[PDB]
């Protein structure tokens, strides 16, 4: 876009309706046994594109709703989804060339192996090349997965350069089959309006 992160989010909030509620987001995090202050600190570093803090990971079974939660953020910020292809090339990173935040949904074991070898510059906040070889600054990347990339020491480079939040609990529904927590553009708008300064925006 060219605008910085603060301008972009402020602008995105402009286009979103009033009347949301940040509470379902906070409540959903605490429901998943995640500490609010810890998460907010992680999100602050993430949006800044801080070296070694440029990849955020949500880890747990599909039924936790980690991907719904993650995708809601992408929708809010109008980020891009990238689709992993096992290669030794960066060609599949095209969609993130011009985005504020990228998402890769359901990273496999093979994906983490790829990241440990081929996404080092991106993990470090240094430019990468996709192709005449063109350099590109990698945007923050949110990944969801059910393969924890920092439990078993298989990926030593990756291991020290990602932040992982675990989602242990199934996405909760009430007695009528309605979700206990809904996470959408308006709730994200309120969330950012409440945490603006604390995110150093």
């Amino acid at each position: 876009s060219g605008s910085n992160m603060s301008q972009w989010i402020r602008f995105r909030c402009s286009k979103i309706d009033e009347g949301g509620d940040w509470r379902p987001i906070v409540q959903f995090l605490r429901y998943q046994q995640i500490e609010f202050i810890t998460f907010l600190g992680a999100l602050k570093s993430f949006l800044k594109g801080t070296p070694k803090k440029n990849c955020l990971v949500f880890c747990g079974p599909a039924n936790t709703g980690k991907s719904y939660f993650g995708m809601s953020f992408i929708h809010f910020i109008q980020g891009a989804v990238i689709s992993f292809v096992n290669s030794t090339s960066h060609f599949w990173l095209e969609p993130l060339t011009d985005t504020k935040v990228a998402m890769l949904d359901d990273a496999t074991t093979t994906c983490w192996t790829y990241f440990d070898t081929y996404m080092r510059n991106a993990l470090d906040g240094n430019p990468i090349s996709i192709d005449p070889l063109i350099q590109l600054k990698c945007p923050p990347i949110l990944l969801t997965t059910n393969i924890h990339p920092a439990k078993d020491n298989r990926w030593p480079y990756l291991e020290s350069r990602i932040t992982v939040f675990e989602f242990p609990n199934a996405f909760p529904f009430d007695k009528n089959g309605n979700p206990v927590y809904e996470i959408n553009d308006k709730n994200w708008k309120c969330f950012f309006e409440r945490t603006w300064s604390r995110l150093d925006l």
């Binding site: 605490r30 429901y31 810890t38």
Partner: protein, 194 residues
């Protein structure tokens, strides 16, 4: 209506959890707010403990944690609360004390069981290798508890050996660079950039 034990525990948890998020919304700079925050967390975990004791699996849609989780988080909350209650009787009571200044994450960071403000970055390069570099924080201010139970404020000192503060006359290292070297390089050589 005669309240079921689960309904009573539910009613109390819902009020506690609402209050907890109020704190997050308010972002008070008052140390007394943080003391209250950590009381709410103790109470929250006490409810989850009692819920499990009563055979309750979920409470207000929340998954009732394992006994060990409830106990660990409560013990953590008490620890922080009592540290803050002591700090509140010191000369430093009326400084800004935020959720961020008083969160568990920071508390668990070296030097542990201390409060700290104003992190200045220290870069350490192992084996002359510039790309093998660990980042540490030299805190502008460290608040520690004395043997008498009062809280004092002091600055961090940097040296080749590590990061330390003077605690009631005693140099007290919270990072040892030798130990860090013997873990990231192993030649006995390291360079400190501050």
């Amino acid at each position: 209506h005669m309240q079921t034990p689960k309904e009573t525990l539910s009613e109390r948890l819902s009020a506690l959890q609402d209050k907890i998020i109020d704190h997050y919304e308010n972002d008070s700079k008052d140390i007394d707010s943080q003391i209250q925050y950590w009381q709410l967390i103790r109470w929250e975990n006490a409810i989850f403990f009692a819920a499990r004791e009563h055979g309750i699996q979920t409470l207000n849609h929340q998954v009732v944690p394992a006994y060990n989780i409830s106990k660990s988080k409560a013990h953590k909350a008490i620890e922080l609360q009592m540290a803050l209650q002591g700090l509140a009787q010191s000369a430093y009571k009326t400084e800004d004390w935020t959720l961020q200044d008083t969160c568990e994450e920071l508390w668990n960071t070296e030097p542990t069981h201390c409060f700290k403000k104003g992190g200045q970055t220290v870069q350490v390069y192992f084996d002359g290798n510039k790309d093998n570099c660990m980042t540490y924080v030299a805190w502008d201010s460290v608040y520690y508890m004395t043997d008498a139970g009062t809280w004092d404020k002091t600055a961090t000192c940097v040296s080749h050996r590590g990061l330390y503060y003077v605690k009631e006359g005693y140099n007290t290292f919270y990072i040892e660079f030798k130990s860090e070297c013997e873990k990231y390089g192993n030649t006995g050589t390291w360079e400190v950039h501050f």
